[PDB]
Ligand binder design. Structure first.
Ligand code: ATP
Ligand code: ATP
Ligand code: 33W
Ligand code: 33W
Ligand code: MG
Ligand code: MG
Ligand code: MG
Ligand code: MG
Lengths: 258, 258
């Protein structure tokens, strides 16, 4: 007869966006999809062997290195006071989203504090302007689950000093997303948002902002933070963001429970 | 007069292994080193712009992808029961080294549990033998600090099924380290150790071991776990491992406090 809701959920797991009601029973539909998914994993294993999340990180890395940005690898486990100094006190939404570790540490919910410190230190060593970026894990306790992950990967890039303009910031964003092949629209110190439909890809800022002084920053700057899993979701037409996460349930958006 | 211990520590920070007592005061020696380090950072920023830790990860990644290993990106924040199922009860050294998060989670001290699960799931989809690997952050509370980091990066590779022999395992290790240009010696189920002097680069294992059954593994296997920061330390002749870590104090083994 008709498919139960549980059967439909089971098939949805095995379903890729590329796949194409009938007089066909669950057993057959499931067996067909199981076959298709196994071949997909076999093809990856025979040919490229690269994880989508790792591969995107390498592509994004090459992009910013080529455009003059220095690659940063900063701590993921950061001091808890970095949170307070970011202006995240107990009345903010983010205050309740912090994964605390021990008494004095936590998991970074963003790349800003570490990059802030790098900007200050590199100013004493590097010529104007100063262009840096980081790609790495970030952690937020989230109530949602359709566009949100508690463990996700963020890309943040910053330029400091000369040429820190709204137009320049939009140009970098535009070149970047056109390079990846991801459609977007920008929605407008100056705080921007990069949208794909009703999905937020990025939040860009045109400094200076009054927060800079706490970190010893006294120059103009432009910056943006992207989520790699959201980028993957859009690029690969994944219906749920969990298909793009670090996961034991999905490899390259393919179910591992076959 | 003579340099104080504090002055010597300060200069040691500014010192690279390549640099070469005299009638020279601290102010001058420090000013010289500050000059040399700034130029190093300027050279990186003008030329390559790549972080040593990220770059090594990409090189290691290319190595194993080319030799038939599938790239894994699994969760860093893992269920706490994975620790108990690894055979780490409250009488082991590792039990006291776990960074717990919330009631039911922790930071992975190793890549084994996630890779164990991937081995089981991929067996139902992939032809013999099954070759996978992962590179990512790992966390252990450590009392030492000269060869140990609390936040470090691990490389683990595994082959399952055919050809899982001591000789084959040693061949992969040998090809790998000769590719990187890192001198070593192997010290001998079968548990191996890859040493650089008195520094442990890796611990390799030739399965099966009785632990496999808890993870639903019933085949022969070979595997090894490397620390990327230790690899960097040896390769770059860093005297302390903190020069190779995710850090706000060092970029590519160069002090950021100039
Ligand atoms: N929980 C999450 N899962 C996946 N990606 C995220 C998450 N939180 C933030 N991001 C990504 O990081 C980028 C920058 O972080 P930011 O603080 O700007 O987002 P946010 O407004 O908190 O996200 P949202 O409003 O969608 O929860 C976002 O554009 C988004 O792509
Ligand atoms: N705290 C740490 N800092 C840096 N690297 C580490 C650390 N712990 C383990 N590693 C690396 O991971 C590899 C595999 O982990 P393993 O559990 O085998 O090491 P270990 O015996 O606990 O290390 P050690 O005896 O030196 O503390 C090691 O060969 C080492 O290079
Ligand atoms: N919002 C992202 C990107 C950045 C904005 C400002 C700086 Br400084 S980094 C983040 O917090 O990482
Ligand atoms: N010791 C390292 C490498 C591995 C050994 C066995 C497996 Br399964 S992975 C680790 O625990 O990741
Ligand atoms: Mg949010
Ligand atoms: Mg935002
Ligand atoms: Mg140890
Ligand atoms: Mg060991």
């Amino acid at each position: 007869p008709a498919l139960t809701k549980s059967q439909t959920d089971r098939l949805e797991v095995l379903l890729n966006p590329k796949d194409e009601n009938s007089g066909k029973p669950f057993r057959e539909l499931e067996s067909e999809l199981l076959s298709r998914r196994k071949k997909d994993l076999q093809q990856i294993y025979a040919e490229e062997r690269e994880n989508y999340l790792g591969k995107l990180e390498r592509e994004i890395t090459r992009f910013f290195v080529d455009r003059g940005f220095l690659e940063i690898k900063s701590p993921i486990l950061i001091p808890l006071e970095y949170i307070e100094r970011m202006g995240i006190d107990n009345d903010t939404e983010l205050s309740k989203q912090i994964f605390r570790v021990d008494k004095n540490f936590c998991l970074r919910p963003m790349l800003a504090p570490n990059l802030y410190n790098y900007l200050r230190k590199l100013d004493r060593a590097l010529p104007d302007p100063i262009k840096i970026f980081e790609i790495g894990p970030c952690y937020r306790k989230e109530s949602d689950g359709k566009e949100h992950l508690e463990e996700f990967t963020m890309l943040s890039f910053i330029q400091m000093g000369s040429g820190c303009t709204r137009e320049n910031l939009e140009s970098i964003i535009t070149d970047f997303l056109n390079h990846l092949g991801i459609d977007f629209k920008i929605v407008g110190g100056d705080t921007l948002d990069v949208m794909h439909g009703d999905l937020e890809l990025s939040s860009a800022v045109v400094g200076p902002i009054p927060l800079d002084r706490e970190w010893g920053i006294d120059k103009p700057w432009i910056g943006a933070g992207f989520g790699l899993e959201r980028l993957l979701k859009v690029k690969h037409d994944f219906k749920n963001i969990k298909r793009a996460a670090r996961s034991e349930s999905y490899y390259n958006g393919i179910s591992t429970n076959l």
